[PDB]
Amino acid sequence: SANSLLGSLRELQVLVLNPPGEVSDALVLQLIRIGCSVRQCWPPPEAFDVPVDVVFTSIFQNRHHDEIAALLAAGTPRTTLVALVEYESPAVLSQIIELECHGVITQPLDAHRVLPVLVSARRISEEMAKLKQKTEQLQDRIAGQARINQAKVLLMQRHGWDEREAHQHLSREAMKRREPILKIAQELLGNEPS
Amino acid sequence: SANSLLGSLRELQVLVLNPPGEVSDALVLQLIRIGCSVRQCWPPPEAFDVPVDVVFTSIFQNRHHDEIAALLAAGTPRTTLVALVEYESPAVLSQIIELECHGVITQPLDAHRVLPVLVSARRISEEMAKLKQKTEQLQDRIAGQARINQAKVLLMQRHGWDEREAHQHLSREAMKRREPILKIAQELL
């Protein structure tokens, strides 16, 4: 919701992943005026040790590129990403595309750019993440039905059972073992197969 | 794809849906320097007329908001949306959220802010459209797989055939009647 998105900003945990300096100070102070919980962080760590909702990062061409790209790829699925951009040139815009930013702030930044990009980027990252998840849920379901299907067919052949028997066995085995019916299929299976 | 995205900016058809004036002017001039096909329109129409890939608009507290909203609600979902924003207060921001922009440019606008926002917003809208397309494909696929599997069990059990035999038969009839395996399967069911 517009009101639930606007009302949740003060609970967001924000990280400013940028070398300490004027850009970083202003950015952190505006986020503190908005009311977000904020922290700056330089050199790029390997992993974040504390939960993070939104990351603000600069775009590097040296060794910090691969560090930032690896760290951010490790993050949680609803991590909002905003890029601090200083160039509109191909190598720089390609990196923003590759990082999958949800919003951009062009430099030099000032206080006025912050909130509109933050809210905006946050509805985008929330929508995208729900869409992605649904895709993943469908993929998972497709693969899982395939595996259960091939374990049933495996049981039919092995035992001379029809489908009902095969299905009955899997369920009974799954039900009384406290393991999903897909677990039994996988434990049964191992055709080194599909 | 970052490369193809950048390489296709000059074929984008961009509409500046905003009142005539300095803001529209400066925005249209920077979209022509970037190289996009750019038109400007005002008052908001009811349907586009010509295909539009990206719309830039402002946030109005009046009837153009609803017009613009309806205009893009009915429009092609791959139309990227960028809002020019001058206030950070809750009713204005709620308007941005309800329009579901793919990117924003806070005012006052200047040329440096345009290209980075147009590209990041375009990636965003295209990635959304792709996930929705994958969702439909996967929904259809799960359903298809089920009927191919229930039809296979049907043949297996009807004829005393193994899975492989049922699969060979489906494929054979399918590819002899120039139709999808799924059609054969649904015919059987």
Next chain:
Amino acid sequence: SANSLLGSLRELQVLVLNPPGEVSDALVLQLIRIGCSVRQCWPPPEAFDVPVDVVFTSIFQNRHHDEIAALLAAGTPRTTLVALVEYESPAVLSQIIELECHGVITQPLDAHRVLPVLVSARRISEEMAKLKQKTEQLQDRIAGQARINQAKVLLMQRHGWDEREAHQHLSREAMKRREPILKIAQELLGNEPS
């Protein structure tokens, strides 16, 4: 080899999975005359607690069917299986087909049937198992190259790297971690994918 097959018989561990009685006695005593290490076993266990090379089993239609079919499906890939057959009828021959026997002895058995079927069934199970294994090795290789291929493409996109860079990274990461290069891909990967 003919001579290596014939010379290895005395090291085979044979199980007679059949109710105790005359059939079982004669069968065990002939296997002891051949010189195999032999044991009889009834009711069908859930798993064999000791290594087994060759199983001799009878063909049941009651509850012992599903027990024997489950136990034998659990066995090791070079387990030779010989069926003791009393009927030539469809339900009985279908079960022998479903169990994947390597040889059959028609009842009533006598000492003369044993060695020729044992040797014969054993060259068959050795050939089949090598053929199966090769199939599995190819399947494994296909899937593994696919996964490495999709992790490289994942790295290309993420980092803006070409294929050489992507390949270099995987190898370096795999090499210095003491984990196959396919392990890195799988740990990297997780598209919930192919």
Next chain:
Amino acid sequence: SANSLLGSLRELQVLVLNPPGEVSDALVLQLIRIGCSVRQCWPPPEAFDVPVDVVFTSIFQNRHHDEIAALLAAGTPRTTLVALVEYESPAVLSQIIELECHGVITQPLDAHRVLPVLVSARRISEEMAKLKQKTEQLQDRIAGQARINQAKVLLMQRHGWDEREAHQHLSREAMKRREPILKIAQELL
């Protein structure tokens, strides 16, 4: 498949490659009761003449062994092989092993021993032929996959295309020149 295997026994073409006499006679009579098409031949020929699905032979210490061996070495691999055996001693058994029988019947033969051995041996030879066929398919597949992947990297890197784009291009040209994706890929390489 146990069901289809049993149901197709009456179409099998069985050859009793053994000297005329009581043994051949009794074996041919039991294969006709089972319902197979059955012929008897003796002395072993050099090539079959007519398609043969299953051969029953005995173990000879003389030149028919080599003749029979060569006869089946050159023959269709799906030809099931069953040996009639009367000795359990090492030279006779070595002969069985070297011929690579799919089943044996120890003598004296009687009708009860035939059908169970014919079926188990037929399953065996068919399963062997299938694993060999899968092995070739998989060898071809691994090779194919590689060239589709090296061609894709080639397009990716040539044009600044992502994997998906490279895949769409291969598929499109492929399915516009009515040829395998692999041919397009190898043309590129």
